[PDB]
Amino acid sequence: GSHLEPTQLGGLVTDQLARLCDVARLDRTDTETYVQTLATSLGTAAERSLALPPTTATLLSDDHTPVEYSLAFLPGATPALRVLVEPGWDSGDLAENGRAGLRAIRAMADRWNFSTDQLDLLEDLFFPVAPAGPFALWCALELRPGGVPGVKVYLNPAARGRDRRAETLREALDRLGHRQAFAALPPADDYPFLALDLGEWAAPRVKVYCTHESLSAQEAGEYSRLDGRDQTTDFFHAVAGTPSTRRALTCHSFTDTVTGRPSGFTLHMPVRSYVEHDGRARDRAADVLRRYGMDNDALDRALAAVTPRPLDDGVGLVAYVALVHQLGRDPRVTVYVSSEAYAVQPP
């Protein structure tokens, strides 16, 4: 429950999260619970001096901060806050990184009374004796009102070597009962992440991410079919600033094991790689939030909550902008915000 100095990594990210919780309009009790949860999940990384180099050159963020924030915008509602964390970041190698990440997940499982049996079922696939990169375990915490967060664990299909990416992904989906989910995935250049929901479900819910090195708006609309192809194509042109093709990720969520069809689609566009500085990245994110009837004012307050620097002084604060489509749900736009605990990428 102790605060940390702003010269320490834990002190910087807990200050950012506490201010982001006010933008999300969480009360003081939930804010206090979640800032301590993020500090605890970092382990010894919380006390590390920011003058030192980052312990792990993690791909979680460009400056290798083991924390990334995101805000999900529903029309007419204040955004929902989430935080992505790498619990094993302050470790020597990937094997130690993975063990520490699994320990933090089990602490969350014991605290909020949910099972890790589905995670234990995939342990040989994603945590071998000598794992390959680029990561071992990330945890996404959905900071819901009430103090009980939604937990997602991110796993690396390349953990047993890049040649076994599809083999590992196909085997994990088979063990989780999603024997036909892989057939619904679009053509991809990589399977970078497998997200697994932890909590209160009698059946496993999974999200499969696909990397597209040269994705077009035409292909993005084609992959979006679950209903709104035009919204996906317009979102592509607005965020990409259209070069014809852009690097982007698609996410495919499966919540049942019956049909083999996905229930969710997400177009995940790295706007930071397209614009010159964060002034333009924020502008494109603001135009999307505004035209979709969302709370673009909260975006600016969230950006100021993370850092006081001028947006034109760098690029990468607005890391990603995502369009989330879910059956029986209104569309949602998610803006991913970098911590920039170590560096601001130059324009």
Residue 273, phi then psi, degrees to nearest 5: -80, -5
Bridge-partner residues for 336, per DSSP? 70, 320
Residue from 279, 323, 284 nearest 303 by CA: 279
Cβ-count burial 312-323 (b if 16+ within 10 Å, e if not): eebbbbbbbbbb
Bridge-partner residues for 254, per DSSP? 206
Query: What residues make up the domain containing 226?
Result: 1-347
Which residues 6+ apart lie within 8 Å of 177 measured at CB? 203, 204, 257
Whether 214 and 245 have beta carbons less than 8 Å apart is answered as yes
Whether 244 and 229 have beta carbons less than 8 Å apart is answered as no
Whether 137 and 87 have beta carbons less than 8 Å apart is answered as yes
Which residues 6+ apart lie within 8 Å of 282 measured at CB? 299, 300, 303, 311, 317, 318
Whether 251 and 262 have beta carbons less than 8 Å apart is answered as no
Cα angle at 139 between 135 and 145, to 5 degrees?
165
Distance between first and last Cα of the chain: 38
Q: Tell me the resolution in Å.
A: 2.2
Burial group, residue 283, by CB count within 10 angstroms (0-12, 13-18, 19+): middle
H or E element, residue 235: helix 229-240
Sign of the dihedral through C-alpha 89, 86, 20, 73: positive
Residue from 115, 283, 286, 104 nearest 202 by CA: 115
Q: Domain count for the chain, please give it.
A: 1
